[PDB]
Each structure stands twice: as C-alpha cells, then as structure tokens.
Symmetry: C3
C-alpha cells in the first residue's frame, strides 16, 4: 500500500495522520499527530531517519530523503522537520533540519546540512545550499537563496494559519 519497510525499520504514525494512497513512505519515518501527506509524495527514510513534527503538511509531489553515514560523513544527514511546518508542492528536502512554523515555498530545494530556524519563510523555486543556516524570522528567496527582509507580524502569524488550514483540509479528506 503506502507504508513500506527498510531493513527492520517501519514508519511510525501518529493520530489523525493523512497519507494519500498515491504516495510512498519507506523505512524510519516518524509522522507526529495531524501530519498530512498529500498526493504523489515520496518520503524515504532508509539510509537514515526522517522525523516530522505535528501539524506539518507535506504538499503534492514533494520528495524527502537523507544521506547515509559515510567515512567523511559519519553522522550522515537525517531529515528533521518541526511542527506547524508548511512544505509546498514539489519541494525537495534532503538531509536538512527545519524548525517550527516555517513555510518552504513550492518548488524549492533544500540540501544536506541546511538548517532553517523557526518562523522562516522561503520563496517558491528557491535553492538552499548545503550547510546553509537560515536565521529565524526572515524571508529568503533565490537560487541560491538570499535573505530578503524580516517577516511582518502578519506573515509570522500566517505561518501558524497556513499549517492550521492544511490540518483542516487534511481532515476533510479523512472524513470522506
């Protein structure tokens, strides 16, 4: 179906979690409560784990992976996502770390080692370089991304609103 194993590892699911039947979730993947996985999304936590916080939405066509533990990269790079996170359509997340209340614009690519602090907004089609740290409360855009400006109080609030909205849209589908 949608949940697949890798070695002895199997996805750990929370409450009210949605995972479209057209998506694929493999290995050590943890989905906290109210997480919604939309259509044609792939989350492969095989060579390392993928942890996703509560009320976080992974939108249509997104792709999530990690990097294996190697010689110069003994720790490898697992994928960690906080709560109230909005991951846009066709986003590419790879071995990075995302705090809480963050919005990753559709079409963006976040590479290994990148760290996105809380209350951050990333413009669509952006590219976040490896080991790039995004300072909290700002808006970044571009390929490679550049810090554009602080977020308005409205925009910060929008981060929470965005997540909630998706939690709701998620529930409407579970209700069908």
């Amino acid at each position: 179906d949608v949940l697949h194993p890798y070695r002895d590892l199997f996805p750990q699911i929370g409450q009210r979690v949605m995972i479209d039947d057209s998506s694929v979730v493999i290995g050590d993947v943890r989905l906290a409560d109210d997480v919604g996985i939309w259509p044609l999304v792939v989350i492969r936590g095989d060579v390392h784990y993928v942890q996703i916080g509560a009320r976080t939405n992974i939108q249509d066509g997104s792709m999530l992976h990690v990097t294996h533990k190697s010689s110069y990269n003994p720790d490898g790079n697992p994928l960690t996502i906080g709560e109230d996170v909005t991951v846009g359509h066709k986003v590419m997340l790879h071995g990075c770390t995302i705090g809480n209340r963050v919005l990753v614009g559709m079409g963006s690519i976040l590479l290994d080692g990148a760290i996105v602090e809380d209350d951050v907004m990333i413009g669509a089609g952006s590219l976040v370089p490896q080991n790039k740290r995004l300072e909290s409360g700002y808006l970044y855009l571009g390929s490679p991304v550049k810090q554009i400006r602080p977020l308005s109080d409205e925009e910060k609030a929008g981060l929470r609103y965005s997540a909630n909205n998706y939690v709701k849209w998620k529930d409407e589908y579970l209700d069908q």
Copy 2:
C-alpha cells in the same frame, strides 16, 4: 480511481479526454474536449476550481493547484503544459507553451500566443504580454515571437492531441 471528489465537487470531463491511470484529479476540475492529462500528474481543485480549455495537454509530472484560502486556476485552449510544470492559481490564455520545469505563481497572467522557456519562474501577479518569449527565474521578456513560432504553438497542441488519441487506442 483517477477522479476524486472534494465533498460535493467532482471533475467534469469533456469529449475524447485522456487521463493516465497514474495521475490524480481531485474536486472541481473542469476538462474541456481533447484535453490530455499525462502520467503522474496531480490537479487539485478543492478550495477553488481548476478550468482547462480544449485541446490542452498537461504533460508528465505536472502539479496544478489553486490559491490557498482566493484564485481559481484557468488555462485556455491549445495550451501546452510542459513536463513537471508547476501551475498555482494563475491564468493562462490560448496557444501558450509552458516550458518543462517552470513554476507559475498565484495571480500570474499569461496572455495568448506566449512561449515560456523551460525552467522558468513567473512570479506572483506577473503579466506576460502576448506574442513574446519569456525565460529565466524570474522570467524576463526576451524578444517577440516570430509568426513561425507563434504558429509552432498551435502545432504543439495539435501534435499532442493526436498523441493522446493514439494512447487512447492501441
């Protein structure tokens, strides 16, 4: 199966429409005649509707959605939507070619007879003048299209129409 409902909203399909079994069409999605939806495509018309004109092709990997809660998705006729194209709450005229891998954001407006180079990013609320070539991330007006090119736009739609009628048969 391939057509999913969003409460009381269900896709409306015209004549000779092609939808791959691997693609997902949800909610108020309106497909005119000869529209061809290709492999692994997702079209979501929940919070708002999605309307796609006649003889339009949505190639492999595209993702079509509307403006989150504020703007429906409208695509004209003879429109060629390249592979892995991202269209979000925008408005596309007739005889338009959206280069594969492009991203068109909320409120963007593409007039008729326009060509968008592959891998482009059309920012939010941006309008593209008819008869021009736009390329880049964010796109820039490159130059005007020759009559020959403006013609090639219609021929692309035509070719893909035959292309989808072929999959429908053999």
Copy 3:
C-alpha cells in the same frame, strides 16, 4: 506491480537484477541494463523514440525521463550513472560515470561526456555539450573547474552504493 506498459508494439526490455518501484511508470521502448534501479514515482516514456539506460545506473525518486518530440532523438544514459531526485532528462545523452544533481534539468540534444558532475538544481540547455572531467553548476550551467581525483572516484562510489541499496529492496521483495 504493473510498472511496465507498452506503446503500440514497443515494450520494455529489462536486464538482470533490475528494480522498478511499484509506484513508477515505464512506457514503451525503454531498455534497462543490469543492476539498473528505478526508484519511487518515476516516469520513463519511450514512445516516439527509445530510452537506453546503461548497467548499474540509478534513476532516483520523482525523476522524469522522456525523448525528443516529433518536429526526433532518443534518451541515452551510460553506465554507473547517478541521476538525482526529481531530475528531468529529455532527449539527451549522458556518458558513463556521471552524477546529475537533484532537481536539475537536461534538455534536448544535450551531450554529457564521461566523468562529470552537475550541481543540484542545474539547467543544461539544448544541444549543450558538457566536457569530460568537470563540474557544471547553475541555470543555465557554467563549467566551474576540473573534478578532483577524489570527486571522480566519488562518481563510482555513488553508483556502487545505489546498486547495493537497490538490491536490498530486491531482497525484501523476493
């Protein structure tokens, strides 16, 4: 399980120890050499022309592979090649031991020579030739510098790792 689809009279040619995720779509004249690994939600369409993928080459999750439209040109990928996540390949040619950075787009007629590295999210324009032994980055790509010996070695290690990971999935299945 129905990943293999035909197109007219053309049908996929599969080699040895080849993996194709059940969520992926392979259509028409697609030829997969030994140890090739087709990952989740990938689409490979060899209808108006064929697709040839050399041995030990990996096509990562969400990639889109197609050939040139009539107006063609087949898609040819060498051996020990590493095609990154969500990469778009279209009527181009890739030599042996090449790593295509995730999110990149390679257009019609592009020719990538052996031992090459393309940065993530790059765009290779039509008929563009990528010279052997270099790193290319950007949209559109620019020749940055020669790959070091370690980097070249890295190309082989990458293909090797994906061949193993592929077999682990083949193991869990069978």
